[PDB]
Amino acid sequence: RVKNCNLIVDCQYGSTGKGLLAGYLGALEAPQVLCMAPSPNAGHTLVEEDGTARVHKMLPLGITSPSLERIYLGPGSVIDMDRLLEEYLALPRQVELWVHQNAAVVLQEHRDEEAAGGLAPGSTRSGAGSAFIAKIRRRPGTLLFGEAVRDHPLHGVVRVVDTRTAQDMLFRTRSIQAEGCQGYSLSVHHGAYPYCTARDVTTAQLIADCGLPYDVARIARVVGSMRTYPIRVANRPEAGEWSGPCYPDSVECQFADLGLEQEYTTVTKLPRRIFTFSAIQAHEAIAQNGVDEVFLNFAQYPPSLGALEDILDAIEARAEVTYVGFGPKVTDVYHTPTRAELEGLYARYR
Amino acid sequence: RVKNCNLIVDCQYGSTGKGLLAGYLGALEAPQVLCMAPSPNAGHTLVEEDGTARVHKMLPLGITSPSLERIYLGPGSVIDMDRLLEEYLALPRQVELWVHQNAAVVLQEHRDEEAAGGLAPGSTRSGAGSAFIAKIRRRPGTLLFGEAVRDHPLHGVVRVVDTRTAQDMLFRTRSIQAEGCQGYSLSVHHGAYPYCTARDVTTAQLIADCGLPYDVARIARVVGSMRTYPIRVANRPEAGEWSGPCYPDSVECQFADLGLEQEYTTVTKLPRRIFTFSAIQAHEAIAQNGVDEVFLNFAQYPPSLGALEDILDAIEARAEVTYVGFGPKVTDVYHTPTRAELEGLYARYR
Ligand SMILES: Nc1ncnc2c1ncn2[C@H]1C[C@H](O)[C@@H](COP(=O)(O)OP(=O)(O)OP(=O)(O)O)O1
Ligand SMILES: Nc1ncnc2c1ncn2[C@H]1C[C@H](O)[C@@H](COP(=O)(O)OP(=O)(O)OP(=O)(O)O)O1
Ligand SMILES: Nc1nc2c(ncn2[C@H]2C[C@H](O)[C@@H](COP(=O)(O)O)O2)c(=O)[nH]1
Ligand SMILES: Nc1nc2c(ncn2[C@H]2C[C@H](O)[C@@H](COP(=O)(O)O)O2)c(=O)[nH]1
């Protein structure tokens, strides 16, 4: 019964625009089921045609799919139940929300622990690491989602499921979209430790955390997202935290070098760090993840068309650049543009 | 260049005989590279024709391969450097040992922490959970393998590698064998929490922790190992620990019910727990892992040939039983026996 499965994986340090990619593919491929293993580290963003933004930390953004029936948050999820309930109630259309019983739960004590600092440099301090560690530690009395939610208003809108139930549902689903979060180079396996997150960030880890059965993974297509200028989170110098290195064929630059205003963080108001494109990073992530199609986003950032074409050429040595993003809306993503069309798009978006 | 990749995954609670399976497939398929992401929870066993046992906690057991060139311990490894050095020096033939720089390391403090009890019921108390959590927590000063080994005699016999180096090596390898450890139903995602280990135990997690590139995983064959009678570790009643449930279509039994002597644990001398076969568990693990070939081991345990054939019939509803084990040696494993041949083997091994 399964005919299509798209896996969306971030090939840099996050913030490549996976909320946009998810919305775009949701409309293009019309999946019936969205899978995700969210953690509350950052909010992914879908900007509507009218300029309104929907920001999701706990739910996928393929909700543009006209065929959407169900969202399944897998056992590798790390769930803020308050935030999940809030995002669910705000959804535009009614859909079933299934959550695996063994997902971790984020409690205030986990946020409190990370708020004291002294852990990963540049940590979002979302509590995600502490919450996940509590699941992994298996101390008596630790409750995973299946038990923790019974105490919480969220229980009235979720179906708690085990893997037998999830398997049956997924094998009966025609088109599946699974949305990764974070970034390949934040992988605790493949990143520059300790400038990284608490888990691996690969196609394989996404399959594991979403609980996708391996025969479905075998037919899946992998869409890798990357920016023209990779970005890391801000430093926290008062806490003595530098948020980490770039690849050796990247150099750190300033937003002003692109004629852009500095990008600050949502709450703390700290300047994000930007770097030039790394072909080594792109090729390494493409190979690790088995990327079949690349989404190259922020194609309007390079200061010349030649600079954009050099990035395209680097990627295309290893994978097709199937989707090109010139802005934050679904209507700003273009499917396999010719080089001639690319010229017109670049000029128009600058 | 990659032509063959076999992934060995345990479909029950461990102790299905993956050391035997690895030795058998190593000789059958002659891989050039063995991949593993070991943790020190238990020792896997290869019994030689003469009755000698080799017990590995840190190294694969496909070392029967006449074409073996290299062992690669992936970034998801959790490494006791003393034990790894000891096992490496005892290997029969010279091979290259590569270890990913981001593997976790087990220190005495991790063993000490788990030795105090009060964590997962039935824990092996190997320190594996604490050591892995230290990697995940990213506290300043925590050293992963790449830095921790420089202080240790092991550094003289290992090549520390990153993912770019591992990728290049793996893509140039004709035949790869990756050996899972632990058991599907010990998965922190798919198991009965907290009667489980610290990570997922699936094909997907194995790919992630071994650092196998996804395009290699795509061509891989999955060999799932299972026993006629699933087994859990012993209870620890003095510590108030029960080691956990079986599936609902299994019932706990006694070794005496099979005419066998009680199986005790290597050090603590505690009785292992045995249960009848669960078809639900088998089918669930086959589906989650995408198992293509099943190794059914301990085929000499069922008290009648009909009881063995019922187990075979249950498995074969979903996957071929390709290998059948009637004893602990490579010469006790039989490839796709006919039912008539099975009759003679069962009679002879009883
Ligand atoms: N091509 C684009 N041009 C300008 N802004 C864009 C473009 N694509 C996306 N954006 C905006 C939307 C968000 O405000 C921001 C980051 O996108 P977002 O979807 O939140 O990233 P993400 O989900 O990949 O990673 P993160 O984990 O950092 O949230 O960039
Ligand atoms: N068919 C068999 N009959 C009898 N003994 C066997 C058979 N196959 C293997 N053994 C023995 C070898 C070991 O002493 C024991 C468990 O095997 P072993 O390779 O250590 O398990 P394993 O690696 O799958 O799991 P564990 O994590 O418990 O070590 O069973
Ligand atoms: N852009 C982005 N960065 C993340 C995300 N999760 C973690 N990071 C980065 C921020 C830090 O550089 C590093 C560690 O953060 P944390 O996992 O929150 O402790 O990983 C995410 O979802 N998006
Ligand atoms: N047979 C076996 N059991 C294991 C292994 N690792 C963990 N377990 C089981 C023992 C307990 O029931 C449970 C938790 O143990 P631990 O991960 O050591 O805290 O998982 C392994 O490698 N082999």
Author numbering:
A (entry chain A), B (entry chain A): 9 to 358
Sentences from the paper on this structure:
Cyanophage S-2L is known to profoundly alter the biophysical properties of its DNA by replacing all adenines (A) with 2-aminoadenines (Z), which still pair with thymines but with a triple hydrogen bond. It was recently demonstrated that a homologue of adenylosuccinate synthetase (PurZ) and a dATP triphosphohydrolase (DatZ) are two important pieces of the metabolism of 2-aminoadenine, participating in the synthesis of ZTGC-DNA. We now propose a complete 2-aminoadenine metabolic pathway for cyanophage S-2L and related Siphoviridae and Podoviridae phages. The post-infection composition of cellular dNTP pool is heavily altered: dATP is eliminated and replaced by dZTP, which is created in turn from dGTP.
PurZ of cyanophage S-2L and related vibriophage φVC8 from Podoviridae family create the immediate precursor of 2-aminoadenine deoxyribose monophosphate (dZMP), N6-succino-2-amino-2′-deoxyadenylate monophosphate (dSMP), from standard dGMP and free aspartic acid (Asp) using ATP as the energy donor. Here, we determine that S-2L PurZ can use either dATP or ATP as a source of energy, thereby also depleting the pool of nucleotides in dATP. We crystallized S-2L PurZ with two of its substrates, dGMP and dATP, and solved its structure at 1.7 Å resolution. Through crystallographic symmetry, a PurZ dimer can be reconstructed for both S-2L and φVC8. Residues G22, S23, N49, A50, T132, Q190, V241 and the backbone atoms of Y21 form a pocket where the base moiety of dGMP is placed. Y21-S23 are positioned next to the amino group of dGMP in position 2, the hydroxyl group of the conserved S23 being 3.7 Å away from the nitrogen atom. Notably, R146 from the dimer’s other molecule forms an ion pair with the α-phosphate. Like ATP in φVC8 PurZ, the base moiety of dATP is stabilized by stacking interactions with F306 and P336 residues. Oxygen atoms from the side chains of N305, Q308 and the backbone of G335 form hydrogen bonds with adenine’s 6-amino group. The corresponding residues in PurZ extend noticeably further, being 7.9 Å (S-2L R244) and 8.5 Å (φVC8 K267) away from C2′, precluding any possible stabilization of the ribonucleotide.
